[PDB]
Amino acid sequence: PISPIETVPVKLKPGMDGPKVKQWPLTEEKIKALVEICTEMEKEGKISKIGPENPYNTPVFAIKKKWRKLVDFRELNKRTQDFWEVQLGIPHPAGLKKKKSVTVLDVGDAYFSVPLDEDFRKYTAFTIPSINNETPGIRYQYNVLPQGWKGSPAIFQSSMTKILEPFAAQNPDIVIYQYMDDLYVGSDLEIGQHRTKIEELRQHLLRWGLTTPDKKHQKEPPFLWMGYELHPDKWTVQPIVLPEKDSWTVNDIQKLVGKLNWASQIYPGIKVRQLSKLLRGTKALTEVIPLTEEAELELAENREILKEPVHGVYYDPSKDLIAEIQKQGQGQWTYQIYQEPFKNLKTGKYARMRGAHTNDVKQLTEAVQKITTESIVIWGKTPKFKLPIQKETWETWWTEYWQATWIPEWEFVNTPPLVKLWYQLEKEPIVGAETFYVDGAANRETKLGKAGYVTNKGRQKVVPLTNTTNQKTELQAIYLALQDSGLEVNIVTDSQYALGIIQAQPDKSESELVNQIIEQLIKKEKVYLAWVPAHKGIGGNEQVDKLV
Amino acid sequence: PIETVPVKLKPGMDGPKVKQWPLTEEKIKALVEICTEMEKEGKISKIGPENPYNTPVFAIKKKSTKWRKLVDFRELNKRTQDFWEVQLGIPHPAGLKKKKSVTVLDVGDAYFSVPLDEDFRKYTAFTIPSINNETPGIRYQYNVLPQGWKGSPAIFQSSMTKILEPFKKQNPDIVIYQYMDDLYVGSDLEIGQHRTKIEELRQHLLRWGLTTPDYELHPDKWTVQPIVLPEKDSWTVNDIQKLVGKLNWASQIYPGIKVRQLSKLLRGTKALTEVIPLTEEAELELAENREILKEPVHGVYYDPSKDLIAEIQKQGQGQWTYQIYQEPFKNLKTGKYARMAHTNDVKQLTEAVQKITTESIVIWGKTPKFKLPIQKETWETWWTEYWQATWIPEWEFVNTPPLVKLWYQ
Ligand SMILES: CCC(=O)n1c(=O)n(CCOc2cc(Cl)ccc2Oc2cc(Cl)cc(C#N)c2)c2ccccc21
Ligand SMILES: [Mg+2]
Ligand SMILES: [Mg+2]
B282 and B363 fall within a common domain: no
A194 and A146 fall within a common domain: no
> Which residues constitute the domain of residue A212?
93-109+154-222
**Total domains, chain B:** 4
A532 and A507 fall within a common domain: yes
On whether residue B47 sits in a domain, the answer given is yes
Whether residue A539 contacts residue B267, with contact meaning beta carbons closer than 8 Å, is answered with yes
Q: Specify the CATH number for the domain of residue A495.
A: 3.30.420.10
Resolution of this PDB entry, in A?
Answer: 2.8
A291 and A180 fall within a common domain: no
CA distance A77 to A152: 11
8 Å CB contact of B268 and A536: no
8 Å CB contact of B131 and A429: no
**Residue in A85, A496, A540 nearest the CB of B269:** A540
On whether residue A423 sits in a domain, the answer given is no
On whether residue B112 sits in a domain, the answer given is yes
Mutate to test the pocket of ligand 1, among A97, A98, A101, A102 (most ligand atoms within 8 A of CB): A102
On whether residue A229 sits in a domain, the answer given is no
Q: Which helix (H) or strand (E) holds B114?
A: none
CA distance B57 to A221: 39
Q: Which residues of B253-286 are buried (b: 16+ CB within 10 A; e: fewer)?
A: bbeebebebbbebbeebbbbbbebeeeeebeebb
A249 and A353 fall within a common domain: no
On whether residue B166 sits in a domain, the answer given is yes
Q: Which method, experimentally, gave rise to this model?
A: X-ray
Calculate the CA B75 to chain-centre distance: 17
According to DSSP, the β-strands at A439-443 and A138-142 are unpaired
Question: Residue A173 annotated as binding?
Answer: no
Any ligand 1 atom below 6 A from CB of A183: no
On whether residue A374 sits in a domain, the answer given is yes
B141 and B19 fall within a common domain: yes
B147 and B289 fall within a common domain: no
Q: Which of B260, B269, B399 is the mutation pick for testing A, counting most A CBs within 10 A?
A: B269
CA distance A409 to A322: 11
Residue B181, Ramachandran bin (φ over 0: left; ψ between -120 and 50: alpha; else beta) = alpha
Q: How many helices (H) and strands (E) does chain B have?
A: 9, 14
Q: Return residues with CB closer than 5 A to ligand 3 (ion).
A: A 331, 358, 508
Radius of gyration from C-alpha coordinates of chain B: 25
Q: Beta partners for B316? A: B319
Whether residue A514 contacts residue A357, with contact meaning beta carbons closer than 8 Å, is answered with yes
A288 and A398 fall within a common domain: no
B44 and B152 fall within a common domain: yes
Q: Which of A378, A412, A446 is the C-terminal boundary of a domain?
A: A412
B49 and B146 fall within a common domain: yes
Cite the DSSP H helix spans in B99-190: 151-170
Q: How far is CA A108 from CA A113, A216, A363, B276, in A?
A: 8, 16, 49, 90
8 Å CB contact of B270 and A403: no
B130 and B25 fall within a common domain: yes
Interface of A with B in 415-474 (CB under 8 A): 429-432, 434-435, 437, 454-456, 458
8 Å CB contact of A540 and B28: no
A490 phi and psi, to 5 degrees?
A: -110, 120
A44 and A137 fall within a common domain: yes
Q: Which helix (H) or strand (E) holds A330?
A: none
B52 and B147 fall within a common domain: yes
What is chain B's length?
Answer: 409
Whether residue B343 contacts residue A406, with contact meaning beta carbons closer than 8 Å, is answered with no
Q: If you measure CA to CA, which chain A residue comes closest to B15?
A: A82
B35 and B138 fall within a common domain: yes
Task: Of B343, B345, B353, give the one whose Cα is nearest residue B311.
Answer: B353
Mutate to test the pocket of ligand 1, among A87, A92, A99 (most ligand atoms within 8 A of CB): A99
Whose CA is closest to atom 25 on ligand 1?
A184
Q: Which helix (H) or strand (E) holds A106?
A: strand A101-106
Q: Specify the CATH number for the domain of residue B56.
A: 3.10.10.10
B402 neighbourhood in chain A, CB within 8 Å: 402
A66: Cβ contacts below 8 Å, ≥ 6 apart: none
On whether residue B1 sits in a domain, the answer given is no
Q: Beta partners for A68? A: A63
B103 and B167 fall within a common domain: yes
Whose CA is closest to atom 22 on ligand 1?
A184
User: Hey, what's the torsion of the CAs at B208, B209, B213, B214, to 10 degrees?
Assistant: 80
> Which residues constitute the domain of residue B238?
217-302
DSSP A338: E
A80 and A175 fall within a common domain: no
A357 phi and psi, to 5 degrees?
A: -140, 130
B149 and B42 fall within a common domain: yes
A361 alpha carbon, closest ligand: 3
DSSP A464: E
DSSP B22: P
On whether residue A314 sits in a domain, the answer given is no
8 Å CB contact of A492 and B272: yes
Q: Beta partners for A248? A: A289
Q: Specify the CATH number for the domain of residue A182.
A: 3.30.70.270
Task: Of B158, B153, B204, B202, give the one whose Cα is nearest residue B180.
Answer: B153
Any ligand 1 atom below 6 A from CB of A233: yes
What is chain A's length?
Answer: 548
Which residue type, as a one-letter code, is found at position A540?
G
CA distance A378 to A271: 23
Q: Specify the CATH number for the domain of residue B212.
A: 3.30.70.270
CA distance A298 to B161: 71
* Residue B49 to chain A, least CA–CA distance (Å): 5
B15 and B142 fall within a common domain: yes
Q: Which residues of B97-111 are buried (b: 16+ CB within 10 A; e: fewer)?
A: bebbbbbbbbbbebb
**Total domains, chain A:** 5
For B161, what's the count of Cα atoms within 13 Å in the CB-facing half-sphere?
10
Q: Which of A538, A543, A544 is the mutation pick for testing B, counting most B CBs within 10 A?
A: A538
Q: Which residues of A286-324 are buried (b: 16+ CB within 10 A; e: fewer)?
A: eeebebeeebeebbeebeebbeeeeebbbbeeeeebbbb
Number of CB atoms found within 10 A of residue A122's CB: 15
A387 and A357 fall within a common domain: yes
- From the number of C-beta atoms within 10 Å of its C-beta (0-12, 13-18, 19+), residue A401 rates as buried
B17 and B100 fall within a common domain: no
A47 and A139 fall within a common domain: yes
A78 and A135 fall within a common domain: yes
Number of CB atoms found within 10 A of residue B50's CB: 19
CA distance A450 to A473: 6
B345 neighbourhood in chain A, CB within 8 Å: 398, 404-406
A199 and A100 fall within a common domain: yes
Q: Which residues of B135-160 are buried (b: 16+ CB within 10 A; e: fewer)?
A: bbbbbbbbbbbbbbbbbbbbbbbebb
CA distance B55 to B47: 14
DSSP A434: -
Q: Which of B216, B245, B280 is the C-terminal boundary of a domain?
A: B216
